[PDB]
Amino acid sequence: EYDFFIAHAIEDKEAFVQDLVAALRDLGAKIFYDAYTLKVGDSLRRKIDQGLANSKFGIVVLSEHFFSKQWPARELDGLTAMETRILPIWHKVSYDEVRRFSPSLADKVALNTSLKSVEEIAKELHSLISAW
Amino acid sequence: EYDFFIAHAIEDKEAFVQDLVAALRDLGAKIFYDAYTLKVGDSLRRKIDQGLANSKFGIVVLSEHFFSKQWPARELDGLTTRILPIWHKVSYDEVRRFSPSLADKVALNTSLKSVEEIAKELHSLISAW
């Protein structure tokens, strides 16, 4: 069982996502990455389910390219549902832009790359899966 | 004579710039922005002073399209009182690559506040001038 899977739009795959995968692996976290690229046509809910069935936590990179995939509204709202094992990260989006797709997601407190560096975010995520 | 001018890259003009202007005008503020689209030749300090002569405050939309205009590092480090940058759709790592000072400076941030909250906050500054 891994620590994280990271769901992301492909457009983000070789930028911020690879940065965050490398930083988290460098701290010793186990992260699924390659099989969690989201493309037009996929099922977000099923992809999230799949990841959670193999990992402690789910990271979803909330970016313009993420929302541009036009996901169903309820599956976005679903990311906010407690059992949380889903940790959104806001990346290069505005509040209004996120509320346009999901008000519940826009009010759910999450990590934000404009407030922390990729390293700082790695450390914080790492804290969730480490004994100290 | 004016409350704000909005310095921006052309890419933001019909998007975030439009939203902010509309919101601020709704609150009764006086704003111009049309003459303040920034290109590459421009001297960021000159453009800003030019606007500060005709306007109480000046807004700079710090987006990726602003940073893509390859501003001289010195103008970025001394970007900022009367100049108010707003971070728009950028990361900290991203801003830091252009100016470590600019990235550490507390500023407005659209990932934290809706356009309307940002407008209210800027509007309250007029009444404090």
Side-chain angles (χ1 to χ4, degrees), chain A residues 64 90-97 112-119, chain B residues 64 87-94 109-116:
Chain A
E64 198 191 358
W90 290 35
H91 187 56
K92 296 163 70 52
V93 284
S94 63
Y95 171 96
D96 287 302
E97 181 178 5
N112 185 327
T113 57
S114 75
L115 306 182
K116 293 186 175 175
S117 71
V118 56
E119 293 72 14
Chain B
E64 131 178 358
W87 287 31
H88 189 52
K89 293 164 63 58
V90 296
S91 73
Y92 173 82
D93 289 321
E94 197 181 8
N109 186 332
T110 62
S111 78
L112 299 198
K113 286 196 173 73
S114 69
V115 187
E116 291 168 17

Short mmCIF file of all heavy atoms in Angstrom, two decimals, chain A residues 64 90-97 112-119, chain B residues 64 87-94 109-116:
data_model
loop_
_atom_site.label_atom_id
_atom_site.label_comp_id
_atom_site.label_asym_id
_atom_site.label_seq_id
_atom_site.Cartn_x
_atom_site.Cartn_y
_atom_site.Cartn_z
N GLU A 64 -6.23 24.88 -13.97
CA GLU A 64 -7.04 25.23 -15.13
C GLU A 64 -7.22 24.02 -16.06
O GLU A 64 -8.32 23.74 -16.53
CB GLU A 64 -6.38 26.40 -15.87
CG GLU A 64 -7.30 27.13 -16.82
CD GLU A 64 -6.55 28.09 -17.71
OE1 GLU A 64 -5.32 28.22 -17.56
OE2 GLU A 64 -7.20 28.73 -18.58
N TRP A 90 -4.46 23.49 -4.99
CA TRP A 90 -4.82 24.54 -5.94
C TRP A 90 -3.56 24.96 -6.66
O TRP A 90 -2.56 25.30 -6.02
CB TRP A 90 -5.40 25.75 -5.21
CG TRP A 90 -6.77 25.54 -4.60
CD1 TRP A 90 -7.26 24.40 -4.03
CD2 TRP A 90 -7.82 26.52 -4.52
NE1 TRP A 90 -8.55 24.61 -3.59
CE2 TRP A 90 -8.92 25.90 -3.89
CE3 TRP A 90 -7.94 27.85 -4.92
CZ2 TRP A 90 -10.12 26.57 -3.64
CZ3 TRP A 90 -9.14 28.52 -4.68
CH2 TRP A 90 -10.21 27.88 -4.05
N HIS A 91 -3.58 24.95 -7.99
CA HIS A 91 -2.39 25.34 -8.75
C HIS A 91 -2.72 26.28 -9.91
O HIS A 91 -3.35 25.89 -10.90
CB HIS A 91 -1.63 24.09 -9.23
CG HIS A 91 -0.32 24.38 -9.88
ND1 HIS A 91 0.69 25.10 -9.25
CD2 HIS A 91 0.17 24.02 -11.09
CE1 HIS A 91 1.73 25.19 -10.06
NE2 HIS A 91 1.44 24.54 -11.18
N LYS A 92 -2.31 27.53 -9.78
CA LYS A 92 -2.53 28.54 -10.82
C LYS A 92 -4.01 28.70 -11.19
O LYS A 92 -4.35 28.93 -12.35
CB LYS A 92 -1.63 28.25 -12.04
CG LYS A 92 -0.13 28.36 -11.70
CD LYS A 92 0.82 27.71 -12.73
CE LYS A 92 0.87 28.48 -14.05
NZ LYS A 92 1.16 29.94 -13.88
N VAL A 93 -4.88 28.59 -10.19
CA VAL A 93 -6.29 28.94 -10.35
C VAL A 93 -6.67 30.08 -9.42
O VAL A 93 -5.99 30.32 -8.41
CB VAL A 93 -7.24 27.77 -10.03
CG1 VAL A 93 -7.26 26.77 -11.17
CG2 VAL A 93 -6.85 27.12 -8.73
N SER A 94 -7.75 30.76 -9.74
CA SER A 94 -8.31 31.73 -8.82
C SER A 94 -9.48 31.10 -8.05
O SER A 94 -10.02 30.05 -8.44
CB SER A 94 -8.81 32.94 -9.60
OG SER A 94 -9.86 32.54 -10.46
N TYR A 95 -9.87 31.74 -6.95
CA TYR A 95 -11.05 31.30 -6.22
C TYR A 95 -12.28 31.29 -7.12
O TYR A 95 -13.06 30.32 -7.12
CB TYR A 95 -11.27 32.19 -5.00
CG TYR A 95 -12.59 31.93 -4.31
CD1 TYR A 95 -12.66 31.08 -3.22
CD2 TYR A 95 -13.77 32.53 -4.76
CE1 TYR A 95 -13.86 30.83 -2.59
CE2 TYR A 95 -14.97 32.28 -4.14
CZ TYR A 95 -15.01 31.43 -3.06
OH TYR A 95 -16.21 31.18 -2.43
N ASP A 96 -12.48 32.36 -7.89
CA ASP A 96 -13.68 32.47 -8.73
C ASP A 96 -13.70 31.35 -9.75
O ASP A 96 -14.75 30.82 -10.10
CB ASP A 96 -13.72 33.82 -9.44
CG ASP A 96 -14.07 34.95 -8.51
OD1 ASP A 96 -15.14 34.93 -7.88
OD2 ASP A 96 -13.26 35.87 -8.40
N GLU A 97 -12.53 31.00 -10.23
CA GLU A 97 -12.42 30.01 -11.28
C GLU A 97 -12.83 28.64 -10.73
O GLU A 97 -13.45 27.84 -11.44
CB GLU A 97 -10.99 29.99 -11.79
CG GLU A 97 -10.72 29.04 -12.89
CD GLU A 97 -9.29 29.13 -13.36
OE1 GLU A 97 -8.50 29.88 -12.74
OE2 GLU A 97 -8.95 28.45 -14.35
N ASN A 112 -2.06 25.18 -1.60
CA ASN A 112 -2.10 26.19 -2.64
C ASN A 112 -0.64 26.51 -2.98
O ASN A 112 0.13 26.91 -2.11
CB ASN A 112 -2.84 27.44 -2.12
CG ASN A 112 -3.04 28.53 -3.18
OD1 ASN A 112 -2.21 28.72 -4.08
ND2 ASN A 112 -4.14 29.28 -3.06
N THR A 113 -0.26 26.32 -4.24
CA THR A 113 1.14 26.52 -4.65
C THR A 113 1.59 27.97 -4.68
O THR A 113 2.80 28.24 -4.83
CB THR A 113 1.41 25.91 -6.04
OG1 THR A 113 0.52 26.49 -7.00
CG2 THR A 113 1.22 24.40 -5.99
N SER A 114 0.65 28.90 -4.56
CA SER A 114 1.02 30.31 -4.55
C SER A 114 1.40 30.75 -3.13
O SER A 114 1.96 31.83 -2.94
CB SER A 114 -0.12 31.17 -5.09
OG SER A 114 -1.17 31.29 -4.15
N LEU A 115 1.10 29.91 -2.15
CA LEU A 115 1.41 30.22 -0.74
C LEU A 115 2.60 29.42 -0.21
O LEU A 115 3.19 29.78 0.81
CB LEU A 115 0.20 29.93 0.14
CG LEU A 115 -1.05 30.64 -0.35
CD1 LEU A 115 -2.21 30.35 0.59
CD2 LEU A 115 -0.77 32.13 -0.50
N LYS A 116 2.92 28.32 -0.89
CA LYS A 116 4.07 27.51 -0.49
C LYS A 116 4.84 26.99 -1.69
O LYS A 116 4.32 26.92 -2.81
CB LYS A 116 3.61 26.33 0.37
CG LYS A 116 3.06 26.73 1.71
CD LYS A 116 2.77 25.53 2.54
CE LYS A 116 2.34 25.93 3.92
NZ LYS A 116 1.95 24.72 4.68
N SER A 117 6.10 26.64 -1.45
CA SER A 117 6.95 26.10 -2.49
C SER A 117 6.64 24.62 -2.62
O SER A 117 6.01 24.04 -1.73
CB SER A 117 8.42 26.29 -2.11
OG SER A 117 8.76 25.42 -1.04
N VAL A 118 7.07 24.01 -3.72
CA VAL A 118 6.89 22.58 -3.89
C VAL A 118 7.54 21.79 -2.74
O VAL A 118 6.95 20.85 -2.23
CB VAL A 118 7.39 22.10 -5.29
CG1 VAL A 118 8.83 22.48 -5.51
CG2 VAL A 118 7.21 20.60 -5.43
N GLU A 119 8.72 22.19 -2.28
CA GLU A 119 9.34 21.55 -1.12
C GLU A 119 8.48 21.67 0.14
O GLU A 119 8.31 20.68 0.87
CB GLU A 119 10.74 22.11 -0.86
CG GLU A 119 11.78 21.79 -1.93
CD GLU A 119 11.58 22.57 -3.23
OE1 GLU A 119 10.80 23.56 -3.25
OE2 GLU A 119 12.21 22.19 -4.23
N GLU B 64 1.14 34.92 -15.02
CA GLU B 64 2.20 34.30 -15.82
C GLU B 64 2.47 35.10 -17.10
O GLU B 64 3.60 35.17 -17.58
CB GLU B 64 1.84 32.83 -16.13
CG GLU B 64 1.97 32.41 -17.57
CD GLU B 64 1.65 30.93 -17.78
OE1 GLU B 64 1.36 30.24 -16.78
OE2 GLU B 64 1.68 30.46 -18.94
N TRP B 87 -1.44 38.92 -7.21
CA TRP B 87 -1.03 37.63 -7.78
C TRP B 87 -2.24 37.00 -8.47
O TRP B 87 -3.33 36.94 -7.89
CB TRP B 87 -0.52 36.69 -6.68
CG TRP B 87 0.83 37.03 -6.13
CD1 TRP B 87 1.38 38.28 -6.01
CD2 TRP B 87 1.81 36.11 -5.65
NE1 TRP B 87 2.64 38.18 -5.46
CE2 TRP B 87 2.92 36.86 -5.23
CE3 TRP B 87 1.84 34.72 -5.51
CZ2 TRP B 87 4.06 36.27 -4.69
CZ3 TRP B 87 2.96 34.13 -4.98
CH2 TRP B 87 4.07 34.91 -4.57
N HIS B 88 -2.06 36.53 -9.70
CA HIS B 88 -3.16 35.90 -10.43
C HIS B 88 -2.68 34.67 -11.16
O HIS B 88 -1.92 34.76 -12.12
CB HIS B 88 -3.77 36.87 -11.44
CG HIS B 88 -5.04 36.35 -12.06
ND1 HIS B 88 -6.10 35.90 -11.30
CD2 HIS B 88 -5.40 36.19 -13.35
CE1 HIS B 88 -7.08 35.51 -12.10
NE2 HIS B 88 -6.68 35.67 -13.35
N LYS B 89 -3.13 33.50 -10.69
CA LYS B 89 -2.84 32.23 -11.35
C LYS B 89 -1.36 31.94 -11.51
O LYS B 89 -0.91 31.46 -12.56
CB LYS B 89 -3.58 32.15 -12.68
CG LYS B 89 -5.10 32.09 -12.52
CD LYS B 89 -5.84 32.39 -13.83
CE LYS B 89 -5.55 31.36 -14.91
NZ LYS B 89 -5.92 29.98 -14.47
N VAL B 90 -0.59 32.21 -10.45
CA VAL B 90 0.84 31.91 -10.44
C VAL B 90 1.19 31.09 -9.21
O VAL B 90 0.44 31.05 -8.25
CB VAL B 90 1.70 33.20 -10.46
CG1 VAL B 90 1.48 33.98 -11.75
CG2 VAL B 90 1.38 34.07 -9.25
N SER B 91 2.33 30.42 -9.23
CA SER B 91 2.79 29.74 -8.03
C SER B 91 3.89 30.56 -7.39
O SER B 91 4.44 31.50 -8.00
CB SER B 91 3.29 28.34 -8.35
OG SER B 91 4.54 28.38 -9.03
N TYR B 92 4.19 30.23 -6.14
CA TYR B 92 5.29 30.87 -5.43
C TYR B 92 6.63 30.54 -6.09
O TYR B 92 7.46 31.43 -6.27
CB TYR B 92 5.32 30.44 -3.96
CG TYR B 92 6.53 30.94 -3.21
CD1 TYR B 92 6.57 32.23 -2.70
CD2 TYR B 92 7.63 30.12 -3.01
CE1 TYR B 92 7.68 32.69 -2.03
CE2 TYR B 92 8.74 30.57 -2.33
CZ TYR B 92 8.75 31.86 -1.84
OH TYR B 92 9.84 32.32 -1.16
N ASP B 93 6.84 29.28 -6.44
CA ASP B 93 8.06 28.85 -7.12
C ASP B 93 8.24 29.63 -8.42
O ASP B 93 9.34 30.06 -8.76
CB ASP B 93 8.04 27.35 -7.41
CG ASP B 93 8.17 26.50 -6.16
OD1 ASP B 93 8.95 26.87 -5.26
OD2 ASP B 93 7.49 25.45 -6.07
N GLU B 94 7.13 29.80 -9.14
CA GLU B 94 7.12 30.54 -10.40
C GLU B 94 7.54 32.01 -10.25
O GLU B 94 8.40 32.50 -10.98
CB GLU B 94 5.71 30.46 -10.99
CG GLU B 94 5.59 30.80 -12.45
CD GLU B 94 4.14 30.70 -12.91
OE1 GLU B 94 3.24 30.51 -12.05
OE2 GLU B 94 3.89 30.81 -14.13
N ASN B 109 -4.09 38.30 -3.71
CA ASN B 109 -3.93 36.99 -4.32
C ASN B 109 -5.30 36.47 -4.70
O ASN B 109 -6.14 36.26 -3.83
CB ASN B 109 -3.25 36.04 -3.33
CG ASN B 109 -2.90 34.68 -3.95
OD1 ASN B 109 -3.56 34.22 -4.88
ND2 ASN B 109 -1.89 34.02 -3.40
N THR B 110 -5.56 36.25 -5.99
CA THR B 110 -6.91 35.87 -6.40
C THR B 110 -7.32 34.44 -6.06
O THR B 110 -8.49 34.08 -6.21
CB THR B 110 -7.14 36.06 -7.91
OG1 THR B 110 -6.25 35.21 -8.63
CG2 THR B 110 -6.94 37.52 -8.31
N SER B 111 -6.36 33.61 -5.63
CA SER B 111 -6.69 32.25 -5.19
C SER B 111 -7.22 32.27 -3.77
O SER B 111 -7.71 31.24 -3.28
CB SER B 111 -5.48 31.31 -5.29
OG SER B 111 -4.56 31.49 -4.22
N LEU B 112 -7.17 33.43 -3.12
CA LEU B 112 -7.59 33.58 -1.72
C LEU B 112 -8.91 34.33 -1.55
O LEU B 112 -9.57 34.24 -0.51
CB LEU B 112 -6.52 34.34 -0.94
CG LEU B 112 -5.13 33.72 -0.86
CD1 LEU B 112 -4.38 34.35 0.29
CD2 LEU B 112 -5.21 32.18 -0.72
N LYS B 113 -9.26 35.12 -2.57
CA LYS B 113 -10.39 36.03 -2.48
C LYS B 113 -11.06 36.12 -3.83
O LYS B 113 -10.39 36.14 -4.87
CB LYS B 113 -9.91 37.44 -2.11
CG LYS B 113 -9.48 37.62 -0.69
CD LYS B 113 -9.41 39.10 -0.36
CE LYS B 113 -9.16 39.33 1.11
NZ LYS B 113 -7.77 39.00 1.46
N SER B 114 -12.39 36.19 -3.82
CA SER B 114 -13.12 36.39 -5.05
C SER B 114 -12.82 37.79 -5.58
O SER B 114 -12.33 38.65 -4.83
CB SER B 114 -14.61 36.26 -4.78
OG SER B 114 -15.02 37.38 -4.00
N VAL B 115 -13.09 38.04 -6.86
CA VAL B 115 -12.90 39.38 -7.40
C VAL B 115 -13.63 40.43 -6.56
O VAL B 115 -13.11 41.52 -6.31
CB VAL B 115 -13.38 39.49 -8.86
CG1 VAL B 115 -13.00 40.85 -9.42
CG2 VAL B 115 -12.75 38.42 -9.70
N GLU B 116 -14.85 40.10 -6.13
CA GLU B 116 -15.67 41.04 -5.38
C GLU B 116 -15.11 41.38 -4.00
O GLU B 116 -15.22 42.52 -3.55
CB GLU B 116 -17.11 40.52 -5.30
CG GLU B 116 -17.81 40.58 -6.67
CD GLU B 116 -19.12 39.82 -6.73
OE1 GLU B 116 -19.68 39.51 -5.64
OE2 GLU B 116 -19.60 39.52 -7.85
#
